[PDB]
């Protein structure tokens, strides 16, 4: 049921870094377990991952640097609400 | 009331804003010529906007207390993830009076950036953002497209659109053409700049004053008053 989101403006996309947003009320301990499952499943498939940040307080989830090849796998993790590819913002 | 600014680095000791901005610990920017990486250039955008809000000679809310977070690099570029982590930093600071959060930046429509802004608005934070300078529908950009954020387009003295984004996602238009404000070229320098960032900073200054006079003023009441006085 989790969906993937990316910037519609192709020049502003930043593939390779993703915000994994977990369902509302997901506890910090579960966000850490979900990130650990992603890293282990990606390693079993021969991919390197790095957790850059763990979110808690505003939205639950984490920021991960990984190949976009892992998106189908990451979208199947049960606590995932949605995954968004990073993108650029600019001074107006 | 405090105005949080998520933007470039600031020249905090420029005479126009000296004493107003408490630079926070927050910095999350993407990687950075030598001329364009000098402090006077890195600091340009945020220093001008801190002046529009709080500046002694040219501020809308002269003397306002501000806090700055660095989410844009020397070229004015940031990421959705860095901006998100900055918004989380503000939420953590709030959990430990009224708050105005000024986001004078835009990217493409982002589900997570809109969701983070929505969570802050649900907690009682007043967020103000630039509509964007793409002569396009603001609903295609973020945080402009978030209904919980006050999205500000730019007009001139004759109420004509400055170009500015427009449409159903723009809550109001405010002055954004040739706005005189602090220039980081030198400690007493001033420069005129145009854009929806300047218009959003004007509205943040108006909001800060309204909230100082009426601390129990909610976002829903405030929003309609700002839209009316535009």
From Swiss-Prot, chain A:
Cleavage by furin and PCSK5 generates a truncated inactive protein that is unable to induce LDLR degradation. Undergoes autocatalytic cleavage in the endoplasmic reticulum to release the propeptide from the N-terminus and the cleavage of the propeptide is strictly required for its maturation and activation. The cleaved propeptide however remains associated with the catalytic domain through non-covalent interactions, preventing potential substrates from accessing its active site. As a result, it is secreted from cells as a propeptide-containing, enzymatically inactive protein. It is found in: Cytoplasm; Secreted; Endosome; Lysosome. Expressed in neuro-epithelioma, colon carcinoma, hepatic and pancreatic cell lines, and in Schwann cells. Residues 1-92 form a propeptide. Belongs to the peptidase S8 family. Monomer. Can self-associate to form dimers and higher multimers which may have increased LDLR degrading activity. The precursor protein but not the mature protein may form multimers. Interacts with APOB, VLDLR, LRP8/APOER2 and BACE1. The full-length immature form (pro-PCSK9) interacts with SCNN1A, SCNN1B and SCNN1G. The pro-PCSK9 form (via C-terminal domain) interacts with LDLR. Interacts (via the C-terminal domain) with ANXA2 (via repeat Annexin 1); the interaction inhibits the degradation of LDLR. Crucial player in the regulation of plasma cholesterol homeostasis. Binds to low-density lipid receptor family members: low density lipoprotein receptor (LDLR), very low density lipoprotein receptor (VLDLR), apolipoprotein E receptor (LRP1/APOER) and apolipoprotein receptor 2 (LRP8/APOER2), and promotes their degradation in intracellular acidic compartments. Acts via a non-proteolytic mechanism to enhance the degradation of the hepatic LDLR through a clathrin LDLRAP1/ARH-mediated pathway. The C-terminal domain (CRD) is essential for the LDLR-binding and degrading activities. The catalytic domain is responsible for mediating its self-association. This is Proprotein convertase subtilisin/kexin type 9. The chain holds residues 61 to 152 of 692 of the full protein.
């Amino acid at each position: 049921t989790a969906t993937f989101h990316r910037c519609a403006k192709d020049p502003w996309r930043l593939p390779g870094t993703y915000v994994v947003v977990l369902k509302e009320e997901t506890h910090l301990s579960q966000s850490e377990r979900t990130a650990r499952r992603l890293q282990a499943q990606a390693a079993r498939r021969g991919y390197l991952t790095k957790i850059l940040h763990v979110f808690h307080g505003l939205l639950p989830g984490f920021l991960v640097k990984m190949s976009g090849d892992l998106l189908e796998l990451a979208l199947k993790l049960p606590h995932v609400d949605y995954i968004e590819e990073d993108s650029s913002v600019f001074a107006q | 009331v405090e105005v949080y600014l998520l933007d470039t680095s600031i020249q905090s000791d420029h005479r126009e804003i000296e004493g107003r901005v408490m630079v926070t610990d927050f910095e999350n920017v993407p990687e950075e010529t030598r001329f364009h990486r000098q402090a006077s250039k890195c600091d340009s955008h945020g220093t001008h906007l801190a002046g529009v809000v709080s500046g002694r000679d040219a501020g809308v809310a002269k003397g306002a207390s501000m806090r700055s977070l660095r989410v844009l690099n020397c070229q004015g570029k940031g990421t959705v993830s860095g901006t998100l982590i900055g918004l989380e930093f503000i939420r953590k600071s709030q959990l430990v009076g009224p708050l105005v959060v000024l986001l004078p930046l835009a990217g493409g429509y982002s589900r997570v950036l809109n969701a983070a802004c929505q969570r802050l608005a649900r907690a009682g934070v007043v967020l103000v953002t630039a509509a964007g300078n793409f002569r396009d529908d603001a609903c295609l950009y973020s945080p402009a497209s978030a209904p919980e954020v006050i999205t500000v387009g730019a007009t001139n003295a004759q109420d004509q659109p400055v170009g500015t984004n427009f449409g159903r996602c723009v809550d109001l238009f405010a002055p954004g053409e040739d706005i005189i404000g602090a220039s980081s070229d030198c400690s007493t320098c001033f420069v005129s700049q145009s854009g929806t960032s300047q218009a959003a900073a004007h509205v943040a200054g108006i909001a800060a004053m309204m909230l100082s006079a009426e601390p129990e003023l909610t976002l829903a009441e405030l929003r309609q008053r700002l839209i009316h006085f535009s």
